[PDB]
Design a binder for this molecule. Structure first.
Ligand SMILES: OC[C@H]1O[C@@H](O)[C@H](O)[C@@H](O)[C@@H]1O[C@@H]1O[C@H](CO[C@H]2OC[C@@H](O)[C@H](O)[C@H]2O)[C@@H](O[C@@H]2O[C@H](CO[C@H]3OC[C@@H](O)[C@H](O)[C@H]3O)[C@@H](O[C@@H]3O[C@H](CO[C@H]4OC[C@@H](O)[C@H](O)[C@H]4O)[C@@H](O)[C@H](O)[C@H]3O)[C@H](O)[C@H]2O)[C@H](O)[C@H]1O
Ligand SMILES: [Ca+2]
Length: 166
């Protein structure tokens, strides 16, 4: 029983994502207005996918004012107050030295936890942490942030997000 949906992108047809809000079920990809050189989001069919056949690729061509201005957010994430969850995801990048923050929070943008400013390498790694839903929310969000200046010119790949009751 996982709390998020389509965490490995397997429900989505391969291709460049043209509808950022609704093109990928289970995810919201929208880009901030300060980002003048838009990123490219692509669901890729690839043989080295960690799970299934597909991964999400994010190519960063430019940044805006804040790192959350290029982001992929899993939503809805269906939870229960007081319950401790395990977050697991796989990530790699085309070139060494990409930076990503993996976060979870509510619809008022309060965070329950994060893996902060993680270094991504050219080989798939798992990234994992635990968080507890500390308030009365039942529908929360899991924003991943890509808009760090270090990432300009790089492509970051993610797959296999699972948020599970501990
Ligand atoms: O304990 C957390 C703390 O850890 C420190 O180490 C770190 O330095 C802090 O940044 C961090 O604080 C938390 O930051 C995140 C954003 O974090 C990124 O931004 C800062 C970077 O330095 C850092 O590396 C990144 O991790 C905040 O989440 C964001 O909150 C804002 C709301 O703006 C304010 O509201 C609450 C207040 O606590 C914040 O300080 C203040 O900025 C949201 O901003 C809104 O975004 C939406 C668009 O949302 C969509 O895209 C982005 C994605 O997050 C979101 O899920 C999508 O739905 C716009 O409509 C609004 O214009 C804009 O206001 C951010 O979405 C949200 O991620 C934490 O609130 C903060 O505690
Ligand atoms: Ca997959």
């Amino acid at each position: 029983l996982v709390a998020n949906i389509n965490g490995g992108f397997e429900s989505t047809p391969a291709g460049v994502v043209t509808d950022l809000a609704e093109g990928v079920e289970g995810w919201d990809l929208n880009v901030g207005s300060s980002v003048t050189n838009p990123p490219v989001f692509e669901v890729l069919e690839t043989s080295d996918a960690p799970e299934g056949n597909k991964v999400l690729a994010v190519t960063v061509n430019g940044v805006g004012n804040n790192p959350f201005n290029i982001q992929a957010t899993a939503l809805p994430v269906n939870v229960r107050p007081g319950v401790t969850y395990t977050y697991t995801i796989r990530a790699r990048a085309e070139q060494d030295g990409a930076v990503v923050s993996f976060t979870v929070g509510n619809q008022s943008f309060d965070e329950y936890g994060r893996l902060h400013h993680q270094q991504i390498t050219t080989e798939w790694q798992p990234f994992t942490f635990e968080f507890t839903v500390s308030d009365q929310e039942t529908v929360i969000r899991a924003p991943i942030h890509f808009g760090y200046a270090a990432n300009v010119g790089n492509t970051i790949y993610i797959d296999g997000l699972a948020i599970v009751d501990l």
